[PDB]
Design a protein around this nucleic acid. Structure first.
Ligand SMILES: [K+]
Ligand SMILES: [K+]
Ligand SMILES: [K+]
Ligand SMILES: [Mg+2]
Ligand SMILES: [Mg+2]
Ligand SMILES: [Mg+2]
Ligand SMILES: [Mg+2]
Ligand SMILES: [Mg+2]
Ligand SMILES: [Mg+2]
Ligand SMILES: [Mg+2]
Ligand SMILES: [Mg+2]
Ligand SMILES: [Mg+2]
Ligand SMILES: [Mg+2]
Ligand SMILES: [Mg+2]
Ligand SMILES: [Mg+2]
Ligand SMILES: [Mg+2]
Ligand SMILES: [Mg+2]
Ligand SMILES: [Mg+2]
Ligand SMILES: [Mg+2]
Ligand SMILES: [Mg+2]
Ligand SMILES: [Mg+2]
Ligand SMILES: [Mg+2]
Ligand SMILES: [Mg+2]
Ligand SMILES: [Mg+2]
Ligand SMILES: [Mg+2]
Ligand SMILES: [Mg+2]
Ligand SMILES: [Mg+2]
Ligand SMILES: [Mg+2]
Ligand SMILES: [Mg+2]
Ligand SMILES: [Mg+2]
Ligand SMILES: [Mg+2]
Ligand SMILES: [Mg+2]
Ligand SMILES: [Mg+2]
Ligand SMILES: [Mg+2]
Ligand SMILES: [Mg+2]
Ligand SMILES: [Mg+2]
Ligand SMILES: [Mg+2]
Ligand SMILES: [Mg+2]
Ligand SMILES: [Mg+2]
Ligand SMILES: [Mg+2]
Ligand SMILES: [Mg+2]
Ligand SMILES: [Mg+2]
Ligand code: NA
Ligand code: NA
Ligand code: NA
Ligand code: NA
Ligand code: NA
Ligand code: NA
Ligand code: NA
Ligand code: NA
Ligand code: NA
Ligand code: NA
Ligand code: NA
Ligand code: NA
Ligand code: NA
Ligand code: NA
Ligand code: NA
Lengths: 169, 144
RNA sequence: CACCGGCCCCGAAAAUGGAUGACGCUUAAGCCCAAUUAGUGAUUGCCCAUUAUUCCUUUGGUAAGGGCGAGAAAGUGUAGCCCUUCCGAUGUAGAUGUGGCCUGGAGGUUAGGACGAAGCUUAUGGCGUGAGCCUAAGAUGGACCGGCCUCUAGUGCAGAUCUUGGUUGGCGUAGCAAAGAUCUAACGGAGAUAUACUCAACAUGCAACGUUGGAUACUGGAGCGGGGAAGGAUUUCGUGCCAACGGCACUCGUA
RNA sequence: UCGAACCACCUAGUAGCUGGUUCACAUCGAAGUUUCCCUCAGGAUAGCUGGUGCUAGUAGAAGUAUUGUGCGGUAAAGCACUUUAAAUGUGCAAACAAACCGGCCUUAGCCAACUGCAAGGCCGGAAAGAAAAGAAUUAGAGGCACCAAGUGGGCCUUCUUCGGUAAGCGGAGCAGGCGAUGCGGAAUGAACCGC
RNA sequence: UGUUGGCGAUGGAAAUGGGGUGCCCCCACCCGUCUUGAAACACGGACCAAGGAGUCAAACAGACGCGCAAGGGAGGAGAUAUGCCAGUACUUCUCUCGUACUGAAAGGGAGAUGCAAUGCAUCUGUGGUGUGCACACGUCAAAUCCGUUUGAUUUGCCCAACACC
RNA sequence: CAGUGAGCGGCGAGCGAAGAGGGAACGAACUCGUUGCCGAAUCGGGUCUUACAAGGCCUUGAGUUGUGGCACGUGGUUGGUGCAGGAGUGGCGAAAUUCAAGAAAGCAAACCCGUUGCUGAAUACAAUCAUGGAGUAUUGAGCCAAAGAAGGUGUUAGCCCAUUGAGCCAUAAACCUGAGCGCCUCAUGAACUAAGCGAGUAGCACUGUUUGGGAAUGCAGUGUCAAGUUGGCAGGUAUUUGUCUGCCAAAGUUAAAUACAGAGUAGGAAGACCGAUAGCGAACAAGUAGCGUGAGCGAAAGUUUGAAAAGCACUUUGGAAAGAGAGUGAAAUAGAACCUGAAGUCGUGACAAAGACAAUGGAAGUACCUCCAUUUCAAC
RNA sequence: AACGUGUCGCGAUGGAUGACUUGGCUUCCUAUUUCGUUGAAGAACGCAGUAAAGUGCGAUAAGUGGUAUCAAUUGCAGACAUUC
RNA sequence: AAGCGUAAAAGCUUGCUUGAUUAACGAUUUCCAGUACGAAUCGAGACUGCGAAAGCAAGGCCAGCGAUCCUUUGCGAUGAACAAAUCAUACCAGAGGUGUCAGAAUAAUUACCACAGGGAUAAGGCUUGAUCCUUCGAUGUCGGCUCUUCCUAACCUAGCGGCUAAGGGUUGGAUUGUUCACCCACUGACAGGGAACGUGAGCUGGGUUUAGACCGUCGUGAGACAGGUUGGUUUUACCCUACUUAGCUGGAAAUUGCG
RNA sequence: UGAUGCAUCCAAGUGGUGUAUAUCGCAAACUGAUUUCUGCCCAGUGCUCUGUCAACGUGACGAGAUUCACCGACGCGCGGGUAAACGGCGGGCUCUCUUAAGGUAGCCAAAUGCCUCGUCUUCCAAUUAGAGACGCGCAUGAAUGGAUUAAUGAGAUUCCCUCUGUCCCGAGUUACUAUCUAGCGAAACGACAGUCAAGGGAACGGACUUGAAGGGCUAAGCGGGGAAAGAAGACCCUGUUGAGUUUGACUCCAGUCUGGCUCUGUGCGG
RNA sequence: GCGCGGUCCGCGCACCA
């Protein structure tokens, strides 16, 4: 006598279960620790083989795209040719001395370009050639309220700026 | 555990709690949510009012990242200040600064009584929140 | 003279032999009233319930009190911590509880076994309301396994025209009846002429088999004759053998 | 093997229909009725039942009386359907969040006005806490939630009855039973008598 | 709560309980099923062994156990003890459920008190009323080993909860 | 993200993704055509250099209806000759009791006393007489361990056997030693020497299918069929008109992280799984024997005697199968498919009664039996 | 009486239970890992002193050659060890 | 339609009118699950009608009606890179309909027939045809033949003056599948009934009731017909009891006690 | 139906069959020898001959998506023909109306007639049977063929002669069985059982109540009972279960016909 | 619902509450 339950939507009406007549469609994770062990062993072997070069190549710092992740930074794919030129490097030479290059990126503002040029210069200083984290802006220190800030409200400014675009045109 | 189930208590009783008159049969009312308009109408109408119909406009390609906008209240503002700066705070002098978008919030709402004056950086704010914080002694600064 | 009631009779006729339950009863053992040992004087003739009253024991409470020479644990539930007290107890479908019983395995703990483990047998008792547990004997067996606390599951059978294997009454029964049919002597063979004795012999070794000779029948040239195809594939031949098979039998066989 | 052959597979096709469903004690214990359904051999839904509780244990109690105060048109009666009208019924009330008796505050709510009426409060008083007249009684703790099962073929009897010639027949009202239950009696009997 | 006899002197004994078989008096319809109703002239039913039927996953809810709490918790992955070890020990960032809802949508977004009528001022605070554990202050009964209990009630604050605003 | 306050859907039952974020992987990138400048510098075939060289010499054979090149000191990946190490693979390679006792059993109440005391000398037994396996067990001493690891051996083994460490030996070609090292040959990097970007294509109309894709997500058929950087395609609601942002289709190659849902070769490690009606149909001469004209269907069946065949010589009755003795063995009650050996059913001996109330069943006694238990015996 | 019934001791028929297990099922890993006209997978017929099936092999037929090892193989026969 | 109600009216005539409008998602009754729909009751606001006035009126009291989705009309945000004009969509209120009226888009036949079930349901008892109690994992169906038994409301036979009496009897043939009926003949007489409408592991198989086929009427048709016609497998006892004959043998405490 | 054909297979093509053919042929239907006939009806439904609308195309409005108008073939509609096409042949001298016409020649209680065992004759002692006649024929009738017919028939019916154990009414005999022995040896079925009368009861008891019988063990028979066995009632009903067949059921698909475009070029005219 | 013809009647055409 169905009482007061939710209305179910369990979505299991195809032949996913393997039986005497069906092959099934399932995926289990019983090899998870074995595969983790294998991956670690491979990484250790590769580091040993490529010694003394670092195992992971150098990458830039980028900003995350949308308005939800505006304030975060991560590693990118490669350095842009503008940054390489500003650091005084050839792309084809950088690829050999261990720097990742990406000719699709754009460099639309000067701050990100400055950050990446600094990364390149630090690496070039620390590199030795054999013969043949991400950075966040600093927090603001305590201060005091000004006369204008006490006097006027920001809600009216926000609302008028919104109304301009909302009813413009 | 199988030793705690009802079927272990029922060994020796023939019908297993289903009766001799109306037996236990396969699907005596249909399969799934069948019959919500005919023979399960009382159940549907009294427990789930509003299941059937249409309402409102459409939105073909919804993305939630442009719609992100969490909120926080004035009486809750003290979760975002450390203990030492809260003790050091006092109206009329040097106040702590709170960065909402770095702490994970977008709009400041104005419920309650503010427990410490401060300077708040927010993307949005409401009328009452702005007025109340100005009276308390802090200020709010719009950011992007 | 008329009517109008009590009892009895007539009105009142069926299919197997039969029903106040049966026998029987008439100074009732029948019908309607009325008593309780009889005009003698206070009070209840007597028989039978899973009911009533009372006594003993169990179990559960919306339980109620007390305590903390062998004995006492601050306690839901036990072999209940101990003592007293009061009330209830049936039940189909159904719900719930249980320091409730049982089976295969895992983590711990404590133990047993060649001076005999598991399994199996029982007029072997003891314990428990019960599911069950434990001991005894084996004139059984020959290598493994018990208790307790947790964990886990392919975990408990009388019935599904249930599934697989074995057994069983019917039962030494129904039958083994188309195609006419064999008899005799001598050889062969373990298949006999097989005895406790008396005793000539019969009345105490029956029945059945092969080969040869003789006798009597059948098929009757669209044949139980002599050759071939399809199908079969060593059934062909000689010497042996006779466990099984030749629905009886064989010393014989397409075995 | 034929009103559509045989073989393997989809296929363990689906079945509101038939059959089966494995241990013991203990505490409780039903329903065959309501509304909606291409519904009538089935569901959902309320009632009946179990478990879990929450809360200030006698509280806002009652399948029963008494007193006071309302409702009614059946039996009987009558007539050239109807005044007259029962017995059994049925609603409400019977002092502790109630009600009573004189200050004060607030409101336009009413009235030509108010210190009049209406409404919500504060303050103070009385109190056989309900006497006497047949003048209640209780194996008399009130209220509030959550989760879920079975059931949804009934049948008999007492009174009341409609249809049917009638019926161990069909359809209803009130209550009690059997179903689900033995035990003691009627020689025997689901339901009679006692329990 | 004592008293008087019988049997019993260590046996192949005596006694008391179990167990087995026969007999007498009394009682007693054949199981499982569906059904209002079965002992039924209603279906299944010759015997024994072994097998034989509410299970696994996933979404939600209620009750109960445990950890933390305006916060709770991953997952995937990594790092090094670690190179017996498919375990255990450790972890940045993030993600998810919650602390805020409402509207078709553009969008907006919740404290109290006092004074006034996007107003002003204070901030140790239940928005108010009714019914309301425990605690505190009084008063009265019953019982008493006289020390106190068991009850009732008055007032203050009323926690949880419910009703009206 | 997300069973989604997207969306599709008799808007019902139901179905159902993408961007962002934390990660795995990552030395990841290149080649034609077109444009410009060259123009046989190219390919095949003979022949010579150790050579079917990316080398020289020669060839009309192919190719101008366009092969090939270039741009906005080092090379072990040119070829020929030599000779090193490492990894991988295969062989070899470790300790310590067959220690003592033939009751070879106990007790001394957590530990110590205790490396010490005291307990029988046994024969019991078997419904007059004879008869009755193997020490990995027990008990006491003692050793090995960088090895206690699980298998074998007549009973339960660190010491009886095998296995395992360090460490040695041998190893055509391939792999690693940034380039392994030489020589000859051949290539080559550093110093001197103007226009352009892939036509029956994209699009559009009709029809069909597919998608969450909704005035059309992808595709197919037919009709129609472009533009030229000023251009074209995409920006999830159709049309016309202005802006803005991203990218440049109609040619090609490409490791790793991922699958192995009824594969296979060589080699391994396991399991809270099944235990011979179970687990694969198959623990066995199992896809076998058998069945069907055929496609196909498809079993049952542990050789599990014993430690070892020591597998019953010999006597004797019988035609033989066999029986009765004797013997092996701890056991024949282990005698050949032979461990244990249940229920059901049957034979036999003894006993109890009684079948004119089918049997079974309940309650209470009694007669007879009892390989059962408990109690008592001279004081209760 | 006989037949039938019941209980106990011994014996048959039958092949359960227990103990055992070179088998199955499931899960992981490693790599110089992937057949054929240079005739494969499958199908047939043969080969031992004795030889039906199975296993191995192909008229060089229960195997020839090479390496390693070291004294067997066995139902019965038969016949270089410094490794023929 | 019917009931209730109504006399300076709620009826009749007459004068003016459009309260049959709008009504902030107010509350409630009936059905009831205390859900909706339909209908109805008490109200607040606007703008009005009639009346001198108090007042009365948001139809004709009480039956006369309809969800989601879709279409369409009236009123007053969106098309996600931006802007304009079309177009499409949205919120709110109506209309187009589901009469199976809480709302699928729906013609026949099977005698060639099938499956899962049902004595919940049709083709001995009760009442007098009715009913639906048993049986649908089956109780073999009309007539005749054969054979036994029982009843009486007496046809013959037998006694009385219409009564007694159930002892013994109650025939054979033509037509028809018949039971029944009718006819011919004999007789003393040619009575009526029960036994699962006695009697199919006793028979027969003419009728009825499968598949083949012909006709008439009916149907567009496939096909139908309590209308006619012709042809159309009748299985098993060896068990227990009953009955008929045929044998052996115990036993009076009906097996024992000496009772 | 004259091969550019008619009928027709196949998923398809330079594919296939009647067709190795050619109207005395090939394909598709109905009736069923001969003899004698074959009546009336074209309203319905078929089959056949002679305004309305799809795509396409054209014009107009519009910034455009659009919108409007015109054109547009078969077919349908109208009008003819056709019954050895499917089929029909009444009702109230007439006249009418139904809807077109109203049963002609024949035949009949028939294998077709309800009433019905029709009425008359014949056949028998007696005939619901048979034959011959008669027709207001429920509901006969003309290639849905009507009437008649010698010969033929394992067709369906009636009577006669002969003959007989079919019967009155049974008796005797034979072979093989059954019956007894030697050898060999099943099955079906199987809750437990198994003497009756009456009662009540799921209304027809072996088991219950109250009576009345019944010593045990056997051999041959028999068909009263065991509501005896056989097979998940095939009749009837139910289920939101099937399948075969039909059509003027709902929704569709091949096949055939028709229009447009395409294949698709060159010259002379209107 | 739409084109026709003579408010109706005839045609030929369309069908998601
Ligand atoms: K009968
Ligand atoms: K017709
Ligand atoms: K016509
Ligand atoms: Mg329900
Ligand atoms: Mg319910
Ligand atoms: Mg399969
Ligand atoms: Mg809409
Ligand atoms: Mg109880
Ligand atoms: Mg129960
Ligand atoms: Mg298991
Ligand atoms: Mg016994
Ligand atoms: Mg199981
Ligand atoms: Mg015989
Ligand atoms: Mg014979
Ligand atoms: Mg015979
Ligand atoms: Mg002759
Ligand atoms: Mg002849
Ligand atoms: Mg023989
Ligand atoms: Mg021979
Ligand atoms: Mg055949
Ligand atoms: Mg009770
Ligand atoms: Mg009256
Ligand atoms: Mg019931
Ligand atoms: Mg919330
Ligand atoms: Mg080129
Ligand atoms: Mg194209
Ligand atoms: Mg699709
Ligand atoms: Mg391009
Ligand atoms: Mg097996
Ligand atoms: Mg044995
Ligand atoms: Mg005797
Ligand atoms: Mg008036
Ligand atoms: Mg109305
Ligand atoms: Mg009205
Ligand atoms: Mg009737
Ligand atoms: Mg017949
Ligand atoms: Mg019709
Ligand atoms: Mg005697
Ligand atoms: Mg005659
Ligand atoms: Mg004609
Ligand atoms: Mg013929
Ligand atoms: Mg049936
Ligand atoms: Na049910
Ligand atoms: Na009596
Ligand atoms: Na069993
Ligand atoms: Na013979
Ligand atoms: Na049923
Ligand atoms: Na029910
Ligand atoms: Na039911
Ligand atoms: Na059942
Ligand atoms: Na029963
Ligand atoms: Na899909
Ligand atoms: Na020794
Ligand atoms: Na409302
Ligand atoms: Na019935
Ligand atoms: Na005639
Ligand atoms: Na007999």
């Amino acid at each position: 006598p169905k009482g007061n339950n939710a209305i179910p939507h369990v979505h299991q009406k195809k032949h996913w279960n393997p039986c005497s007549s069906q092959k099934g469609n399932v995926k289990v994770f019983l090899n998870q620790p074995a595969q983790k062990h294998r991956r670690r062993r491979l990484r250790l072997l590769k580091a040993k083989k490529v010694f003394p070069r670092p195992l992971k190549a150098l990458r830039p710092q980028v900003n995350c795209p949308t308005v939800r992740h505006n304030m975060k930074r991560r590693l990118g794919r490669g350095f842009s040719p503008a940054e390489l030129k500003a650091a005084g490097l050839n792309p084809q030479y950088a690829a050999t001395i261990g720097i990742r290059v990406d000719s699709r990126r754009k460099n639309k503002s000067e701050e990100g370009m400055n950050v990446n040029v600094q990364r390149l210069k630090t690496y070039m200083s620390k590199l030795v050639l054999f013969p043949m984290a991400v950075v966040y802006p600093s927090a603001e220190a305590p201060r005091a309220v000004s006369a204008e800030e006490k006097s006027m409200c920001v809600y009216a400014f926000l609302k008028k700026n919104h109304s301009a675009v909302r009813f413009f045109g | 555990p199988t030793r705690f189930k009802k079927c272990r208590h029922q060994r020796g009783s023939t019908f297993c709690g289903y009766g001799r008159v109306g037996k236990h049969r396969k699907h005596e009312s249909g399969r799934g949510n069948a019959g919500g308009m005919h023979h399960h109408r009382i159940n549907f109408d009294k427990y789930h009012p509003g299941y059937f119909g249409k309402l409102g406009m459409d939105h073909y390609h919804r993305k939630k990242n442009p719609m992100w906008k969490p909120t926080i209240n004035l009486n809750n503002l003290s979760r975002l200040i450390a203990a030492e700066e809260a003790a050091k705070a006092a109206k009329g002098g040097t106040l702590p600064v709170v960065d909402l978008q770095s702490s994970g919030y977008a709009k400041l709402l104005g419920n309650g009584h503010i427990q410490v004056p401060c300077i708040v950086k927010a993307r949005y704010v409401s009328k009452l929140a702005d007025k109340k914080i100005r009276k308390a002694g802090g200020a709010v600064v719009l950011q992007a």
